[PDB]
């Protein structure tokens, strides 16, 4: 089965895009990474950066989780972001998604060996 890292980067990494161009740009990716297919996740974040970069947050700033777990790290610089959020328009399996681009501090955990993101909590 997919491994936990290899979720991460389906679900959160697009490094092919610096940002966000239009306001569908959600409702492309959330389909296309397959995140709509058994229901419509209902947030879910997309990081405009080099794999490397967020990789690397797992040797940055020690932060308990949102949920209380201590293998969360923070990155020490922004990064470009693009917030999907689901609209009340949305419709299973017709899944829609309000797109925000930002700049700000990424959280994830980290787990293994090597020790990489596993996980999006939060954007600071």
């Known amino acids: 089965k997919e491994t936990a890292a290899a979720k991460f980067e389906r679900q959160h990494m697009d490094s ?8 569908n740009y959600c409702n492309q990716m959330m389909k296309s990474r397959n995140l709509t297919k058994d229901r419509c996740k209902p947030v879910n974040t997309f990081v405009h950066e ?3 970069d967020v990789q690397a947050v797992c040797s940055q700033k020690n932060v308990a989780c949102k949920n ?8 020490y610089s922004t ?11 949305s419709k299973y399996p017709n899944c829609a998604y309000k797109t925000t681009q930002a700049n700000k501090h990424i959280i994830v955990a980290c787990e293994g060996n090597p020790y990489v993101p596993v996980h999006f909590d939060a954007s600071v």
């Open 79 to 89: 990064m470009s972001i693009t917030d999907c959020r689901e609209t009340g328009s």
């Open 68 to 75: 209380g777990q201590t293998n969360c790290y923070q990155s």
């Open 50 to 52: 080099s794999l490397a």
């Open 16 to 23: 092919s895009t610096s940002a966000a161009s239009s306001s």
